[PDB]
Design a protein around this ligand. Structure first.
Ligand SMILES: CNC(=O)c1cccc(CNC(=O)[C@H]2CCCN2C(=O)C2(c3ccc(Cl)cc3)CCCC2)c1
Ligand SMILES: [Zn+2]
Ligand SMILES: [Zn+2]
Length: 484
């Protein structure tokens, strides 16, 4: 036992009286449902565990609740029975919804006064059913708390969870989390980007901004093989190379928010080096860009994205990559992209908004004299003067759509989607030294393309749907990156 029974009764009884005072919303909930009297004989075929305010009052008054979550569980059983049995458009359904809003406001401050994370009944995002959020138990006081509220990971703290209350009471502080973003192995690329971001943020000197970390978490050597269609026409003759080698890299940016890691940006790139045959030579392809919109302050979010993306273009330019490519079309309605379960209010941008966003960033990159020029693939193709000449990237649009044929008219209708970004133009691009990546390979199967991370996130309910859930998913993804 944690609580003297009378203490639990005095704390919780006012939240029950708050529901009882709601008239008419509590009237269907004050007494056990009597299916005969109400003419609803199928009630007990649908509702296996009836619950009502008078039963909860008796359990409270007789000391039947040993800890407050058993009370919260009975309140939500009552709400869920009503939402299950009654139609969404029915009076009882709407009364139930109103009572659940009254309960959430009342129970929050009570559960926090009793030393709990919150008083919320929490379930994951959407076989008609939702998975419940997990609890951990303080080894010192025995209070149960949301795993995600207190960010307790068994790998980081194997001896068990100790709540803030028990740590203060014993003049102790939580053992440092060494599975941090900052402690991921550093790369030259990562250091360059993060130094750019933090320099900008220090110039703004805004009180809300946290330190940013940028880490390369995957680097491996791959090959894209030419598809059979285009292999027939161009490769089979010996006119075009059969496969193009590249380095695939994955990087993430993390911000300190409320003193813990938050992963807010993700990037996959394909890097076609100087020993890669034309027409891919000295080209970089940004496969996927994703974000979780919790960057603080929100007034500097776009500018921080600019520092990372303009920074990457500056870094590859200096090494001797001439051209950048971005496939600027949104993901399809149903595809998570990099981060599983975005906030519902982080809307996939419309094509026009996405194109305009990328245009503004590249204009900044022109002002800084990092980008020479940028145009749609149509103008750049006209200006370069066959289909053999098209840069051919793993998982890109053009290798797919060129199979549908087996070009000129197709580019014009999809011109605004494909940005070509000139980093090095003219004679400067003729007599460059070899491209030598000063960072080693980083083997990491989890970050080998975007699917392994999406699979882990689905399997373990690592959502980025709220700040608190994004903070847990960041902590979990960092433990996995640290223990490969
Ligand atoms: C409810 N919503 C979802 O379920 C959902 C599903 C899938 C994805 C998303 C959110 N993800 C995105 O918008 C991704 C892909 C398209 C670009 N993008 C970004 O994060 C960046 C961006 C550019 C421009 C603008 Cl205007 C907004 C953002 C950040 C800077 C570079 C790219 C949400
Ligand atoms: Zn909680
Ligand atoms: Zn405790």
């Amino acid at each position: 036992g944690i609580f003297k029974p009378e203490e639990l009764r005095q704390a919780l009884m006012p939240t029950l009286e708050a529901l009882y005072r709601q008239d008419p919303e509590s009237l269907p909930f004050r007494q056990p449902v009597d299916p005969q009297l109400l003419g609803i004989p199928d009630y007990f075929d649908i509702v296996k565990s009836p619950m009502d305010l008078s039963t909860i009052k008796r359990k409270l008054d007789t000391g039947q609740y040993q800890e407050p979550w058993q009370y919260v569980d009975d309140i939500w059983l009552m709400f869920n029975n009503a939402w299950l049995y009654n139609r969404k458009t029915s009076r009882v359904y709407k009364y139930c919804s109103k009572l659940s809003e009254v309960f959430e406001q009342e129970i929050d401050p009570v559960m926090q006064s009793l030393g709990y994370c919150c008083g919320r009944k929490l379930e994951f995002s959407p076989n008609d059913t939702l998975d419940p959020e997990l609890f951990v138990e303080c080894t010192e006081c025995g209070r149960k708390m949301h795993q995600i509220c207190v960010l307790h990971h068994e790998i980081i703290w194997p001896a068990g969870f100790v709540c803030d209350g028990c740590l203060k009471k014993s003049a102790r502080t939580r053992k440092e989390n060494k599975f941090s973003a900052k402690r991921l192995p550093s790369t030259r690329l990562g250091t360059f980007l993060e130094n750019r971001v933090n320099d900008f943020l220090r110039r703004q000197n805004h009180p809300e901004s946290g330190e940013v970390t940028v880490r390369v978490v995957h680097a491996s050597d791959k090959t894209v093989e030419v598809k059979p269609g285009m292999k027939a026409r161009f490769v089979d003759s010996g006119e075009m190379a059969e496969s193009f080698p590249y380095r695939t890299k994955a990087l993430f940016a993390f911000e300190e928010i409320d003193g813990v890691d938050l992963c807010f940006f993700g990037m996959h790139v394909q890097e076609y080096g100087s020993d890669c045959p034309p027409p891919n030579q000295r080209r970089v392809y940004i496969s996927y860009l994703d974000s979780v919109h919790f960057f603080r302050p929100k007034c500097l979010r776009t500018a921080v994205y600019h520092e990372i993306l303009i920074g990457y273009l500056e870094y590859v330019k200096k090494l001797g990559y001439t051209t950048g490519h971005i496939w600027a079309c949104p993901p399809s309605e149903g595809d998570d992209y990099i981060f599983h379960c975005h906030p519902p209010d982080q809307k996939i941008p419309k094509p026009k908004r996405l194109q305009e966003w990328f245009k503004k960033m590249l204009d900044k990159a022109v002002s800084e004299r990092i980008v020479h020029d940028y145009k749609d693939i149509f103008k750049q193709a006209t200006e370069d003067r066959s289909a053999k000449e098209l840069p051919y990237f793993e998982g890109d649009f053009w290798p797919n759509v060129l199979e549908e044929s087996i070009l000129y008219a197709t580019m014009e209708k999809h011109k605004e989607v494909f940005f070509v970004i000139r980093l090095i133009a003219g004679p400067a691009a003729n007599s460059l030294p070899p491209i030598v990546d000063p960072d080693p390979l980083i083997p990491c199967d989890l970050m080998d393309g975007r699917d392994a991370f999406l699979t882990l996130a689905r399997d373990k309910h690592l959502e980025f749907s709220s700040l608190r859930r994004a903070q847990w998913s960041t902590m979990c993804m960092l433990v996995e990156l640290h223990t490969q």
